[model samples]
Target: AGSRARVYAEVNSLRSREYWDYEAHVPSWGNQDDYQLVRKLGRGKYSEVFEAINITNNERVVVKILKPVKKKKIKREVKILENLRGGTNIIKLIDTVKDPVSKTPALVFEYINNTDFKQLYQILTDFDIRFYMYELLKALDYCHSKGIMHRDVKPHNVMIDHQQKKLRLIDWGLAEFYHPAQEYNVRVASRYFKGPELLVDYQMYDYSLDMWSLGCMLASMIFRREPFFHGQDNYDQLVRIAKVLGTEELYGYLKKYHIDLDPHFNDILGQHSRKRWENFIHSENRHLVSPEALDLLDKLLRYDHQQRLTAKEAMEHPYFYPVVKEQS
Candidate 1:
């Protein structure tokens, strides 16, 4: 009982629950003198990202600032980032700051030369897309192998190194290592990229959770539309999966691993269902999505987690054939 109390206390203390209060409040970075803030690139619900020039090295970087009361979030994000400092694809956390006025904290990260996957998909050649996607897969493989699950694996977090033609994984705030057989909350993580085990709140989860996200991301790149557009909210997201891939699609993928989908989702969509993603793929570029690429997408974003392809498995998939040949 004492041990349980201590554990609960630790978790409660680590929760940055107060960060919710700072929403809608915009803060400025003009006063901070260590680095020169160039311009604001983007802003999210709670943070602002900026393009900055590191005065010491005269190097470009990205600075992400969060609300002041979110100490727990800051510590947690920085701790994980500090641990992942040396990874090849993971974003490097360069520096940190605490705003004098708002007391908010900010993190400085390595700035990549290329745009994110979502933006690049619009203008890049198929070969370039394949090459970069392969880089993303390799990076995710490394993260998973290290027991780090990037709960969010969307294209926004994916960056490219233009000169080297390499893919880089940024944003470690949503990442954490999971112990085997631990129970995790279903609603706390991402809905679209989340796996069946997670959507149903199964007692166990692994790095494969990230695979689902990767699959959704890759499918989006090929289809040029968000994966599972029908998802209006939380409940609808799960239903969208069932609509696209039937119950068998869920169970068949997981049968070998002895995992199952939500029993409540007994009736699934038919053969002539959203399963045919041709409508989503651009007619002009429809031919670009090869059979092997579809096979990989099926394995990744399909119904079951166990059946989902690993990052290593994706490397072997024929979707990478053209990119592989080009590099080799």
Candidate 2:
């Protein structure tokens, strides 16, 4: 028996094949000369992202130059961007271009003056986190509702402009279509934020995987813990999570799906008791802890994916009531 998403389970089927079959739709490359590189922003495995100026409008934008990769992956990212156009907090894709001689493709997007997450997180007051995280949930819910899962949901992927308290969910390189009927590669998401299903090698996961990563992110923010799980390796990763969620619950989760734990963990994992959320709060982070915040954190970090709160449900939680009221 396979677990299914609590919502948007058939969203991909509801849309046309043209939308889901991204490889079939080829992109028309734009004129690369229109943009002049301003400065280096970041470099990653798949792309070198830069701050650029569009000469026509003299507007600032982000240019992500894709490294030599399969044409299919490029099409998938571009198509997903088109499908999610003008969405709430979703990074806006402005154009796609390629070097004529080299044929290296690149994606142009709206730029945000993102304060490094390390600096941003340190300065965000308790209420500020409420606002930004609520904004994040909006992005997550939007992606999930549209039959997508952002496999990588981590601090770096979240672009935040502290001055305006603006947030954008960027870097959709690892994003994938959510087919409720299909299996997916488990090799997605960062090591620390990998969901229980991913670590257990369960392929039939859904949008809730993002929720797990989000939960891990929020925990680090609230507790001032850099990678709260702090696992050295993949096996150690689950061992760290087991320390918090308890091995008993993780065992139940495995048994439910008939998954067998790798024997490597037999020596590594000992029976762990679920620790109380409040125990994580201390002098440095006590200010961030509240009943509703703790309650919401617990719900999202579950070993069971279906049991985690959906982004929409998370936005409605009492933890965000203040932020929600302000928006209304």
Candidate 3:
């Protein structure tokens, strides 16, 4: 009845029950002995990732020890990765294992030799940004085609190996199978990358949410802002967006969807005119700003989730023309 995904809206319905039903599915367990943690990679809200080694093959791997959560949630994460299979740049789920005694479930993945994105981001050329962003779209489009919504799409979840020009969209723990007109949790993506639909508590969001997250990532890169919309709390996050996109436009989006703005916003989101994209450009980031880049960002960072570019549409955008030319 409300808004839905522009593409692949009915895909989950076409799949077999086993394929879509993560609640009832079971992941086949494997041996933990073959994999040993070599060092800590990083800690997350739900997991502690580690660099590991395959004892048998001596291959470096990643061991992501998922903290205790619902068994259903864990199953869904495993199933999404399994369903995506070898889809473009989607992280590979090599194996699933656990601590035998403690029964702490853990996942194993093939390690990518990646530099910290923050360190690599500053050094990226304009063309490099286009090339890698296009690569990320391959992963997004592949997953969306399979009727999956990667609820978490952010810089931390994307790994880049600059030397090989490789990108992997990782962290499927928040991903879920998309059903037509489904109500998903708004508390999925990180604060900075959360879409307007999320902040406004719209549950009937879809694959387009990833596009908003991607837009935030691209905005941060081009503007040299750690987060383009820097909000300290969930409430203020909308205010940050309103300052740029304008409060009137946000109200239009709200009324269009018949949504009620949280009363808290009346105090914070005073009327604001839409800020020009050019206003953000200074000599420092001028090199990254192009007509095509600005156009792409405008198409992506819309208040209406439906207005945001789909993965396929974004890949074909003029911003990626240079990369597309090379592909031909």
Candidate 4:
């Protein structure tokens, strides 16, 4: 029989076999069977996270349970993390369990504690703030080169274990490759952490999107204030974006993408539209932030994504290298 077709009965059969009887090779952590749930950390749409104590080791671990159909999500998450295992700057996944009592697929991972960077900065000294930010840049730069775009690079996603002096990147649901064969318009990532390229509907954007968000994170770290701020509502948020970037050009792209800009265009400040945000930096502003730091802040705030600095470039920037502690 001539087999020139892309889809075949055997291919369908193979897909069914893979899905119907997929089994994952898991590691044993002194019998997850005897673990007792000490406390519930939190829950999400398809999963719930809990802090548990291993009966044998008398050690604490965080467990996540996947709600029935979320088997795929759990597997994908495991695969992504498994691929990125054990970097000094990365969080570690110890083991996973598929106990029947779970009533859904479950995974066990190492637990680390500390406030998120957003809160940590407010409570910590300037030295702590700079150190955390530097560690964050190192991780971001490493992951970026490996083609892993932490699409949701914000304070919330960066976790610190104060006891160990560790800074780790968590949350991979929004992470995706820089270039995919198919462009998805599913609108992933938080509206506040969104990049201008996403705002302009550029499906084929590169790591620049992450850099823009990183800039926002860096701003939060430096000024102890939010950057590229938008309002509670998505529309109001876009208005704030229009405030910093341009409304005319943004509206033009919106129209081209067939996105409604009425709410955004109508609400923008009248004369503010013509004002370029490039001149925002001044002597008065220099007093508000460290002059050396503000210089780096300006790069992150660039309206043009191309004008934005890459993570690797940011690591080498004077804002981080010379002015900050030189910790390799």
TM-score of 2: 0.98
211-281 per-residue lDDT for model 2 (tens digits) = 99999989988888967788898888999999989998889999988888888889988999999999898
Candidate 2: 10-residue stretch with minimal lDDT: 67-76
For candidate 3, the TM-score is 0.98
lDDT at residue 161 of model 4 (Cα atoms): 79
Which is the winner by lDDT between candidate 2 and candidate 4?
A: 2
Model 3 lDDT tens row, 1-328: 7988889999989879999999888888877777878899999878999999998999899999989666888999988888989999998989999887788899999899897988888888898889989999999999999999998898888999999988999999899989988888898999999999999999999999999999999988887787789899988999999999999999999999988778988899888999989999998899999989999999999999989999999999989999999889
Candidate 3: stretches off by over 4 Å: none
* Clashing residue pairs for model 4: none
lDDT by residue (tens digit), candidate 4, 1-328 = 2111111213323333322222362333234476788899788776788889888788888777667675555565665565557644766677756675544556777777856555566565545655676788777776555545667777767778776888887766556434333353536557777776566455545556677777777666555566446556555665666666566756565554445434454644343463443345454333335555666766776545555777767777765653255553
**Weakest lDDT window of 10 consecutive positions for candidate 3:** 29-38
CA lDDT of each prediction against the hidden true structure = 0.66, 0.91, 0.91, 0.61
Candidate 1 residue runs with Cα over 4 Å from true position: 1-32, 100-103, 113-119, 161-166, 188-191, 228-230, 248-282
* lDDT score of residue 94 within candidate 1: 78
Worst 10 residues of 4 by lDDT: 1-10
